Design a binder for this molecule. Structure first.
Ligand SMILES: [Mg+2]
Ligand SMILES: [Zn+2]
Lengths: 51, 56, 353, 106, 38
């Protein structure tokens, strides 16, 4: 499920906001950050097959 | 003394008779000042400043 | 200027304007303010409320009514009554106004003491010479058609933005700029001022301009060689010192007033280089031909004619054709401008919002 | 039927009250309802059943403003919990503060 | 210095306590040069 990073997790734990958004993962997924190895590898593989 | 008689608050503090309560009053006012105030506003009006013994 | 010419110490001098409202506590002092800052009656600021009492309580000895042509107006005369003074003086270049209130000055501050000729000082080197001119720009046919049908209120804007004026101004500006002359362009209409300024890429000043910005513009226009021309409006019509200004142009006007014409001309009458041999200032008046502007133009320049200034009609501006580019030179631009000008007329619920 | 509501939030807050508890202190749904309605003057619309009803229930809905908030949807239920907790603690239905109970004696 | 001054000798120094340690028309964004003073 595309876990976050240590720096991102620590920042969220701090008082950046009253509570983490219920759909924070969904919002970051659209931005493209915090992906998975499967997705990370698939895009790279497709980037080569295209050429 | 950081605060002289030119301050209205001090005039009340200096009017306290007993030393113990008078000492407490002076400390509460003087402890919060972080400058010697070589020049202090004149009591007649705040336009001109009256020279007071200080070092800045 | 007050401090420069007299020996009054700055401590005894106090300024009363919108920025600062403190008043001198000295026994005797001078207060320089504006009538609007003292003639107001209904509402005043807490800082100004004390100042109003400060002015009224004390008995002043002398009152100087600068630009005394506006003291007989609706309410500025209240300062003369509310403020106590044993002597009153009036200072104005033009002692004329549309209504009959000009004569009210006789019993308000007294009669007229002294007057000075204009041409006499010009020949003595005290003031510069002016080559007054009046350019008759025939409005283009397309705009003239709308001029006939359009109502009077909208008619003014139509002939003030005619393409011919734009082209004439551009040629004159370039020709005068090549001559190293400082040009001032007056325009009572704010919309025209902005359109002219943005089109020509030059600074403009009018009512909305703040005090800080305009002061920087004025200083830059005086000593900065890069900025040789500006675009002033009715705000700078009078009482602003421009020792460097030499040339003056106007595109719009406030109907038939004979004082604004003289007041506007005064911007170039105090030029620094008013004694060098052969120097002659210039005053150009762009008026659309075959329009009501002639009725106002011939009526709004009657006072200067009495003083001695003579306007020269310029039917042709030589070399205008040879200029590389002129605004609205093609019909396409004229049509686009025609339509453009024509179209002008629960504390916890706080998180919810 | 006896009777704005277009923008009312679909979420609902339901409070169940005990008749045996509400008759120990002489109160009626009229005074408590207006007490809630006056705590938040007009923010939320509420309806209360009459005493004759077998069960006493008050249904509350918070009306969203004209502007639509998309970020508040995730915390929409959370906000209801926030007001629900406050509506239970900081609401003075009647009486003087710091008076937990009173007993009559002869 | 006070003791020497009491003796009447010139004190070639002073008490350190006496050392008093002492917008419209935005179409010309950058053309305007700040001629604030003359
Ligand atoms: Mg003047
Ligand atoms: Zn000190």
């Amino acid at each position: 499920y595309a876990t976050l990073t240590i720096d991102e997790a620590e920042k969220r734990m701090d008082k950046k906001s009253g509570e983490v958004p219920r759909w924070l993962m969904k919002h970051l997924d659209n931005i493209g950050t915090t992906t998975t190895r499967y997705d990370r590898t698939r895009r790279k593989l497709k980037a080569v097959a295209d050429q | 003394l950081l605060l002289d008689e030119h301050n209205e608050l001090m005039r009340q503090a200096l009017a306290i008779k007993d030393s113990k309560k008078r000492f407490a009053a002076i400390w509460t006012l003087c402890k919060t000042k972080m400058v010697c105030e070589t020049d202090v506003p004149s009591e007649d009006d705040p336009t001109q400043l009256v020279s007071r013994g200080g070092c800045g | 200027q007050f401090l420069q010419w007299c020996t009054l110490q700055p401590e005894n001098c106090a300024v009363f304007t919108s920025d600062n409202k403190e008043m001198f506590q000295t026994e005797s002092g001078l207060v320089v303010s504006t009538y609007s800052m003292v003639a107001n009656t209904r509402n005043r600021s807490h800082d100004s409320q004390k100042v109003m009492d400060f002015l009224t309580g004390r008995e002043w000895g002398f009152i100087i009514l600068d630009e005394v042509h506006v003291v007989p107006a609706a309410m500025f005369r209240r300062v003369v009554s509310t403020i106590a003074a044993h002597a009153k003086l009036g200072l104005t270049a033009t002692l004329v106004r549309e209504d009959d209130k000009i004569g009210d000055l006789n019993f308000l501050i007294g009669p007229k003491l002294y007057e000075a000729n204009w041409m006499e000082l010009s020949q003595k080197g005290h003031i510069a010479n002016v080559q007054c001119a009046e350019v008759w720009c025939p409005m283009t046919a397309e705009f003239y058609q709308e001029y006939l049908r359009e109502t009077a209120r909208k008619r003014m804007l139509l002939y003030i933005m005619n393409p011919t004026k734009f082209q004439a101004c551009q040629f004159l500006i370039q020709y005068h700029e090549r001559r190293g002359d400082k040009i001032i362009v007056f325009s009572d209409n704010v919309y025209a001022l902005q359109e002219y300024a943005l089109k020509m890429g030059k600074p403009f000043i009018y009512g909305s301009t703040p005090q800080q910005e305009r002061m920087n513009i004025l200083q830059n226009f005086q000593y900065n060689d890069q900025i040789n021309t500006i675009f002033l409006s009715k705000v700078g019509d009078t009482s602003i010192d421009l020792p460097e200004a030499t040339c003056l142009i106007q595109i719009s006007s406030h109907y038939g007033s004979r004082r604004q014409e003289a007041q506007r001309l005064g911007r170039i009458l105090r030029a620094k280089r008013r004694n060098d041999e052969g120097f002659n200032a210039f005053f150009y008046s762009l008026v659309s031909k075959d329009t009501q502007e002639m009725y106002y133009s011939t009526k709004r320049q009657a006072f200067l004619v009495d003083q001695g200034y003579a306007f020269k009609v310029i039917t042709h501006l030589h070399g205008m054709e040879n200029i590389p580019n002129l605004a609205y030179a093609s019909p396409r631009e004229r049509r686009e401008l025609l339509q453009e000008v024509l179209l002008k007329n629960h504390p916890l619920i706080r998180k919810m919002y | 039927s006896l009777l704005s509501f277009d923008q009312q939030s679909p979420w609902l807050l339901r409070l169940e009250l005990d008749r045996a508890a509400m008759n120990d202190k002489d109160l009626t749904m009229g005074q408590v309802g207006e007490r809630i309605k006056q705590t938040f003057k007009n923010d939320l619309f509420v309806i209360w059943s009459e005493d004759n009803d077998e069960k006493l229930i008050i249904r509350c809905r918070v009306v969203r403003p004209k502007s639509l908030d998309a970020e508040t949807e995730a915390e929409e239920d959370h906000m209801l919990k926030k007001i629900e907790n406050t509506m239970l603690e900081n609401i003075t239905l009647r009486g003087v503060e710091n008076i937990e109970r009173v007993v009559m004696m002869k | 210095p006070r003791k020497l001054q009491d003796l009447g000798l010139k004190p070639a120094s002073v008490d350190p306590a006496t050392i008093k340690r002492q917008i419209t028309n935005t179409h010309m964004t950058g053309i305007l040069k700040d001629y604030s003073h003359r």
